[PDB]
Design a protein around this ligand. Structure first.
Ligand SMILES: *[C@@H]1O[C@H](CO)[C@@H](O[C@@H]2O[C@H](CO)[C@@H](O)[C@H](O)[C@H]2NC(C)=O)[C@H](O)[C@H]1NC(C)=O
Ligand SMILES: *[C@@H]1O[C@H](CO)[C@@H](O[C@@H]2O[C@H](CO)[C@@H](O)[C@H](O)[C@H]2NC(C)=O)[C@H](O)[C@H]1NC(C)=O
Ligand code: BGC
Ligand code: NA
Length: 755
């Protein structure tokens, strides 16, 4: 087939990783330039894998790396492959967005999967630790297994961590063979997601075989699968806008049986299960001693599906189908008339969860969603390259004025294009309220300098997105924000603009990465941990002040946004060793929004990872946090001074009369102050250490408190999972839900809290 004319195939290639010392390293690889024919009859396996591996990238024997990104582009066509496509560390596999190409498995295909994102060597060891397998894309493909035997075949071995996405993929599999069909679209053994959007699964034994700590996956369609979704294990998983059609089972979450359930929790929102034998198979019963198998249904239709929820241990129909299920919860609930202050295990349908109309799509009544923009219809001439217009991107030159002038000059029908590189910013960049910005394979934008961002007593925004009260369209995609050296006064992004319509103001595949990699000066040599000594809290190891601030009047749509403070060093020489980086605050949301956050994560800040202050109209699904591993050496009262202009938590005061004072002074997972109409559909809020020691895991007591609701907040929490916090949820200083009352298979889990 002809070239599509998609801008990405043609835009001038001027990108280069600033901290790769090879001046000839090529970020962009078109597989046909490596000899792929794309006719569906020539074997293209070698050419595709060569396009990925070229340039001494992070493969076997490489723990991780950030200086060898690649964007591997597949023009329209059909690519016959007979061995796995091995996606090296930090690879974007980008099929043509206008006419997604087919990856066609040969009849005699051999290997784990058509795409393997984490191979196993002959010793059974992964190339990369699954929890460290960050910063990936696979987008715009048809994966066709129908020439393979019905007894074998997997589309993608998707064993990955955060800042990863599958987007716009069709999986075509065989429908014959009965119980002997074993094809599956995704095979996932473990990991720590992550986002998936806009997937279609046709046929196979399993649309997806899933196992992961946590994931957010929305707009998935399953047609004619035996089981659409086999949930092998998890701690939490949020599905939204799932369409299951003519399957035997929709979601199987009964693995392990009633005395060994390995699925922690599942949430299913805004979905439809059609012409399916059993909608959801579960082993949960409210008389069980634990919370494993927690399930939330919210706005799920069950057309032509006679059994909506079945207990497959007893064979008993829990919920009848052929109706709309407004709300269903099984697991433990707190608050309101049902659970109260002590909590109660339930398995019941109940009243609809009414959500503010400003959060909803008016055409569907579902919570509003929008996938990462690829600008299919924008001609290449509308793209304004920052490097063509005076920015150097070399990680040393001050690019502030050039970037500001570009932002001031572009008109709304253009798109600012960040060529790959590292762009040093030394004072506030004012982003206008009508702009579109997209990056070449996660370019770095780094707050640098030696004064402007140095003062935690006088913090300053790095990117100031709109001025207060402005409204328009601001879209950013495929970027990383960080610091060049310590910048403890940097507010990485201050979000003032509001979208003219839902989704018109937002971030997609935009991450904040504080420390840990080449260019930050915050790596193993500077910031290695030392748990045996009282932490000196080196000034050279500070991060930023606050990674994201949605101010009053601001409104944003966030999807696949990882707000990460480095727990360990990422270049291969560091061998994943752990470091101390002191970053004050994660995500702070204020005002009436709305704010949507799909597949966001915020990890390892000192004071809090998410905080809402005087906020309304917040929808997050699902969220994930971690406490920094060095606490409590130092504890959360250091090294950031309490600043009431940000409603900072004051642990010295809040922990004074704590009955668990030894670990009270620890970062909040979620803190809500005077905030209402906040909805959280799925949360994994984890505390894994005390001064790098994990003894506290044995007694689920690495910290005292994890979620705080304060000042008459009204927050709706669904599928709240926490790890090793004595109190899961505290209201006005009073512990409400305790870990010991809600034990799951690893975390503790509350199905439903409403205030
Ligand atoms: C869910 O994702 C699918 C897969 O990307 C979307 O279907 C595509 O929609 C575009 C635009 O309408 C078409 O050009 C493609 O041909 C579609 N592909 C397939 C395989 O159907 C779908 O629009 C998404 N649904 C929602 C509600 O966002
Ligand atoms: C919830 O998960 C826990 C953890 O896996 C289950 O407890 C384990 O059950 C297996 C049997 O399948 C035992 O071999 C382990 O020793 C148990 N571990 C612990 C720490 O108790 C528990 O049975 C599950 N609960 C439900 C109701 O399914
Ligand atoms: O292995 C280290 C990784 O462990 C995971 O649990 C965390 O989510 C990551 O932030 C971290 O870098
Ligand atoms: Na860890």
């Amino acid at each position: 087939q002809a070239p599509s004319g998609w801008w990405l195939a043609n835009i001038a290639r001027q990108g280069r990783p600033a901290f790769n010392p090879d001046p000839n390293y090529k970020i962009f690889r078109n597989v046909k330039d490596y000899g792929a024919v794309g006719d569906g009859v020539t074997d293209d396996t070698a050419a595709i894998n060569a396009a990925i591996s070229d340039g001494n990238r992070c493969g076997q024997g490489c723990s991780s790396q950030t200086t060898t990104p690649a964007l591997v582009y597949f023009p329209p066509g059909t690519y016959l492959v007979s061995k796995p496509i091995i996606s090296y560390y930090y690879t974007q596999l980008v099929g043509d967005a206008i006419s997604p190409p087919t990856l066609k498995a040969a009849a005699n295909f051999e290997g784990m999967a058509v795409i393997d994102a984490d191979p196993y060597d002959e010793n059974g060891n992964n190339w990369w630790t699954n929890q460290n397998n960050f910063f990936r894309q696979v987008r715009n493909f048809v994966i066709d297994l129908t020439a393979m035997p019905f007894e074998v075949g997997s589309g993608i071995h998707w064993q990955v961590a955060q800042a990863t996405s599958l987007q716009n993929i069709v999986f075509n599999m065989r429908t014959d063979g009965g119980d002997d069909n074993r094809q599956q679209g995704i095979f996932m053994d473990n990991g720590s997601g992550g986002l998936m959007v806009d997937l279609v699964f046709n046929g196979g034994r399993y649309g997806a075989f899933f196992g992961n700590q946590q994931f957010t996956t929305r707009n998935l369609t399953f047609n004619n699968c035996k089981t659409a979704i086999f949930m092998n294990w998890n701690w939490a998983w949020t599905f939204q806008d799932v369409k299951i059609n003519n399957c035997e089972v929709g979601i199987d979450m009964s693995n392990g049986g009633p005395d060994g359930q390995t699925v922690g929790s599942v949430l299913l929102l805004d979905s439809h299960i059609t012409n399916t034998g059993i909608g959801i198979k579960t082993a949960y019963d409210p008389a069980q001693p634990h919370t494993n198998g927690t399930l939330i249904l919210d706005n799920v239709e069950m057309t032509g599906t006679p059994i909506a929820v079945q207990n497959d241990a007893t064979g008993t129909t829990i919920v009848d189908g052929n109706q709309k299920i407004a709300f269903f919860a099984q697991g433990r609930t707190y608050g309101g008339s049902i659970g109260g202050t002590s909590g109660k295990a339930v398995q019941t349908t109940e009243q609809a969860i009414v959500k503010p109309n400003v959060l909803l799509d008016p055409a569907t009544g579902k919570v509003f969603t929008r996938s990462r923009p690829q600008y299919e219809d924008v001609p290449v001439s509308s793209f304004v390259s920052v490097k063509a217009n005076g920015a150097k991107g070399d990680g040393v030159t001050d690019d502030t004025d050039a970037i500001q002038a570009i932002f001031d000059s572009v008109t709304p029908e253009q798109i600012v294009y960040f060529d790959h590189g590292a762009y040093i910013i030394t004072k506030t960049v004012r982003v206008p309220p009508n702009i579109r910005i997209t990056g070449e394979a996660l370019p770095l934008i780094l707050a640098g300098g030696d004064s402007f961002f140095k003062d935690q007593a006088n913090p300053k925004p790095v990117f100031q997105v709109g001025q207060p009260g402005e409204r328009g369209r601001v879209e950013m995609s495929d970027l990383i924000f960080g610091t060049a050296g310590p910048q403890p006064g940097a507010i990485m992004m201050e979000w003032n603009v509001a979208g003219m319509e839902p989704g018109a103001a937002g971030l997609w595949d935009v991450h904040t990465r504080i420390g840990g990699y080449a260019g930050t000066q915050l790596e193993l040599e500077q910031c290695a941990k030392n748990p045996n000594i009282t932490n000196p809290i080196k000034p050279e190891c500070f991060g930023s002040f606050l990674m994201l601030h949605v101010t009053p009047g601001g409104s944003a749509y966030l999807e696949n946004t990882w707000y990460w403070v480095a727990d360990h060093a990422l270049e291969p020489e560091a061998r994943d060793q752990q470091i101390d980086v002191f970053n004050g605050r994660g995500v702070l949301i204020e005002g009436d929004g709305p704010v949507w956050g799909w597949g966001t994560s915020s990890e390892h800040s000192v004071l809090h990872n998410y905080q809402f202050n005087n906020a309304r109209n917040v929808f997050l699904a699902l969220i994930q946090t971690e406490t920094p591993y060095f606490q409590g050496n130092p504890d959360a009262t250091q090294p950031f001074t309490v600043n009431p202009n940000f409603a900072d938590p004051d642990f010295a005061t809040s922990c004074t009369n704590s009955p668990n004072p030894e670990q009270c002074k620890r970062a909040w997972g979620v803190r809500a102050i005077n905030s209402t109409d906040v909805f959280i559909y799925g949360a994994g809020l984890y505390s894994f250490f005390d001064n790098y020691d994990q003894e506290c895991l044995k007694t689920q007591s690495c910290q005292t408190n994890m979620v705080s609701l304060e000042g008459n907040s009204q927050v709706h929490l669904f599928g709240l999972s926490t790890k090793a916090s004595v109190n899961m949820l505290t209201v006005d200083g009073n512990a409400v839900a305790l870990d010991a009352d809600n034990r799951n298979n690893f975390c503790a889990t509350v199905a439903w809290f409403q205030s």
